[PDB]
Design a binder for this molecule. Sequence first.
Ligand code: HEM
Ligand SMILES: CCC(=O)O[C@]1(C(=O)CCl)[C@@H](C)C[C@H]2[C@@H]3CCC4=CC(=O)C=C[C@]4(C)[C@@]3(F)[C@@H](O)C[C@@]21C
Length: 447
Amino acid sequence: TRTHGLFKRLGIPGPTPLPLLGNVLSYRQGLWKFDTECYKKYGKMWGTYEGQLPVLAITDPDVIRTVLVKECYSVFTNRRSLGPVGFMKSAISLAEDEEWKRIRSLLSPTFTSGKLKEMFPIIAQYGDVLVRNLRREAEKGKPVTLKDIFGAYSMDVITGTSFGVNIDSLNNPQDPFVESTKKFLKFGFLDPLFLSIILFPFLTPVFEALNVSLFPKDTINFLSKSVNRMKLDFLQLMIDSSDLELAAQSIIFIFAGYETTSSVLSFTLYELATHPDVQQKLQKEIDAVLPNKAPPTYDAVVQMEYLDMVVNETLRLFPVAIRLERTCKKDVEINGVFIPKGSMVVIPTYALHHDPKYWTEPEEFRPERFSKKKDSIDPYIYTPFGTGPRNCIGMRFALMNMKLALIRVLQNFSFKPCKETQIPLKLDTQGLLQPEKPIVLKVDSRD
Ligand code: HEM
Ligand SMILES: CCC(=O)O[C@]1(C(=O)CCl)[C@@H](C)C[C@H]2[C@@H]3CCC4=CC(=O)C=C[C@]4(C)[C@@]3(F)[C@@H](O)C[C@@]21C
């Protein structure tokens, strides 16, 4: 209760904390659900405690633009106070202040639209693997469990592009890359370690000194073992430019991009199933641009307007990262409130994405929201990839992979519900947004 008066004192509303734990019990229902309930309850700003760590949640866009862009470098440079990660404290999402400022700089040339335009054929090759895989499953007439197919694609594309070559994960379950990377799936709140770290950060130096890491030590090595072993994609581009630092980044990319890409694709496809009119219209768009199942190309995949709007609206409904988190590296005035050092600020993307103030019929899937014809979207309400210098660096790359996959599958099949399709979709209560029950759809071919 050392800090459990901070918000009472500073005139900031919030749910009453419980000793030691904080409001953390409220997280078991899921953060997206907690973040919104508070939003509705407390308005523009509410405070909570993670054990002892205060947490300030801002919804006003200007305040957001302050935290995310204006004073990203003067104050809010780090995300969540670092945990027992050992040497992956070099990977870019985890580094802080200057160490990150460098690593960011030294990886930017890899994620420019130019290098992406370059990598395009190495990615689109993975769509042929994907189509066979989805035909196999649907040739039968058998409902398809999307997370198998598109989890597989997600990993194949990232593994191969990040380091190595095609694994065809679905048909090589015993591949040593497949079993080892599959272990990022259980990240966040689930592990006892994260809880003890969340509630008692002062143990973090301890676990480091005991070589106990949040990450699966069993796999971190095998990846590093395969990285140094190799020393067309991220690898060589990293090659041209420490050797531990290089080995981290390769792993974080797989981390930051494996499960997000996967959940978003099956989310997109779920919505196309339950709005067949949107599914035709995108099919029409695809067939006019690449007639007779033509091979995709970079400048096409980028200029497909509806397709962009379709991915974009899905990220409105399903911001897989739920919230954006920054740490005050110094005392700071955030919108007339005095916020001590170490504190965390939360920009509640999911809740802001579902606000009726900014989105007519917020629960409805309406790709038209993103018509370039309409008034541009506020980049601090819509924060699916972050904004500011700390945003998803692979943003352009992820949108490419998903669009590539979505095109290939939509050239060859449609998607519709069946008896086993959960409608409405329900979210799970842990980690990145995922469905309560896995998505299964009927996938008939167009011929
Ligand atoms: C649908 C796919 C993805 C989504 C929704 C997503 C979302 C996000 C978000 C919200 C952040 C943090 C933003 C912030 O702090 O405000 C982030 C960070 C990051 N993402 Fe992604 N991401 C995706 C895919 C990827 C992929 C494929 C990669 C790399 C190949 C990637 C690499 C990274 C990295 C390195 C960071 C941390 C960089 C930093 O802290 O400066 N992301 N991502
Ligand atoms: C998990 C793969 C990944 O790299 O995700 C992150 C990212 O930037 C790219 Cl998505 C990663 C560094 C840490 C991730 C957050 C930790 C706390 C956390 C616990 C949850 O239960 C739900 C969401 C977050 C709040 C989080 F998961 C997401 O925002 C995504 C973050 C920031």
